[PDB]
């Protein structure tokens, strides 16, 4: 089987800068009959099926912009993207169809850099509906921030609570390149009504001190 080696595994550049990713095949993909290298590049955005960019190593598929350029022959190939934009955030895969089985490289994930941005934090007490049953989930949204690295700490009456929290990060925004995340602390109705102060603290490099959002039950 022909092994496709892609590098780097991930790239991070600012909008407008040029990027180059490499794909090396374990043996020549050059067909002597057609005199073409059977190497193609595909772009796959979050939740979408892949879409071809280049085939025959350097031929652009109709509809693909000039800023996407494929080069190479034999075992060394490259895909270059100039005027990079958030729209280009995706994983790029090379694939050889010279000798079956067709094989894909591991992919190169393109992420964009941008100005640091503090998260907009919002805290939400459990809903009346959820409380009616035996549950109580407190939710905090940390929206539109950058970089992606962020820490959320939950405190009940001033003391940290580590169990019962579920966190989820969105994919990098396709337009402004920021990230968002949700943190949900689930407790029993009894635990919730047994305490008063609930706060989520967001530690991010945009601030020396964490952003704190909180609410007191008896104030509800």
């Amino acid at each position: 089987d022909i092994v496709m080696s892609q590098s780097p595994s991930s790239l991070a550049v600012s909008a407008g800068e040029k990027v180059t990713m490499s794909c090396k095949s374990s043996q020549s993909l050059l067909n002597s009959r057609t005199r073409k290298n059977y190497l193609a590049w595909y772009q796959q955005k979050p939740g979408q099926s892949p879409k071809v960019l280049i085939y025959w190593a350097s031929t652009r598929e109709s509809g693909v912009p000039d800023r996407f350029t494929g080069r190479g022959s034999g075992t060394d190939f490259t895909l270059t993207i100039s005027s990079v934009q958030a729209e280009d955030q995706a994983v790029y895969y090379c694939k050889q169809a010279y000798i079956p089985p067709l094989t894909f490289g591991a992919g190169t994930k393109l992420e964009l850099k941008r100005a640091d941005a503090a998260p907009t934090v919002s805290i939400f007490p459990p809903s009346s509906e959820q409380l009616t049953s035996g549950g109580a989930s407190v939710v905090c949204f940390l929206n539109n921030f950058y970089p992606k690295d962020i820490n959320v700490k939950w405190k009940i009456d001033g003391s940290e609570r580590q169990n019962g929290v579920l966190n989820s990060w969105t994919d990098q925004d396709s337009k402004d390149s920021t990230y968002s995340m949700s943190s949900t602390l689930t407790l029993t109705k009894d635990e919730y009504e047994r305490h008063n102060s609930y706060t989520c603290e967001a530690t991010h490099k945009t601030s020396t001190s964490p952003i704190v959002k909180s609410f007191n039950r008896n104030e509800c």
Binding site: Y42, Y55, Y93, P101, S133, F141, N143, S168
Partner: protein, 218 residues
């Protein structure tokens, strides 16, 4: 136009069988081979093999020999993929794609996600997320929708039947003890809510759940 339409998401228990379809239109089905490519959650693309649409003969990549079967229903321009004795590891998205002489896939199906799990199907509970009755108000206001305790994926969440699309973030569902939890947020001008209604529409096809939860001040 040329299009490949794949069947919906499948939930199967280990040891069971699943058969998914890929309907082609816009071209002569028998003039192009149909290939299958799968992708495990968060990982790379794997070529499974292809089916000769003229002859019907399938060829499988080593990793997919044995339990996988490519078949056709030529009259309906449809290709099928059947997986026998499912394993938890078969959990992934399966794509069908048309292969061209120039050696590349020019059209792909949207993919069919099959999850292999012993977990039982259960409807979600949908809770509105509104600011606390004693929290400070700003120029903008962020509202939410918590979709908790359901299985399996997926669930759809929109705001005002889709009319509210900007300022929306839907967070990837996370699995915990056989149940998924997902949330979605919307940010609108403080001058639009609560004077104008904002409601999250959530649906869980597996349980035929459909709830339109209006976000109301506490």
């Amino acid at each position: 136009q040329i299009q490949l339409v794949q069947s919906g998401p499948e939930l199967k228990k280990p040891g069971e069988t699943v058969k998914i379809s890929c309907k082609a239109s816009g071209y002569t089905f028998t003039d192009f081979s149909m290939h299958w490519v799968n992708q495990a959650p968060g990982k790379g693309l794997n070529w499974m093999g292809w089916v000769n649409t003229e002859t019907g003969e399938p060829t499988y990549a080593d990793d997919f020999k044995g339990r996988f079967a490519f078949s056709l229903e030529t009259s309906a321009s449809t290709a099928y993929l059947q997986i026998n004795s499912l394993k938890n590891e078969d959990t992934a998205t399966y794509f069908c794609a048309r292969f061209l002489l120039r050696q590349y896939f020019d059209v792909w199906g949207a993919g069919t996600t099959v999850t292999v799990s012993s977990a039982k199907t259960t409807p979600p509970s949908v809770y509105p997320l509104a600011p606390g009755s004693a929290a400070q108000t700003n120029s903008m206001v962020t509202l939410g929708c918590l979709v908790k305790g359901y299985f399996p994926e997926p669930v759809t969440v929109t705001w005002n039947s889709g009319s509210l699309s900007s300022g929306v973030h839907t967070f990837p569902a996370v699995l915990q003890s056989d149940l998924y939890t997902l949330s979605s947020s919307v940010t609108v001008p403080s001058s639009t809510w609560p004077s104008e209604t904002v409601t999250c529409n959530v649906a869980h096809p597996a349980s035929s759940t459909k709830v339109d939860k209006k976000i109301v001040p506490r």
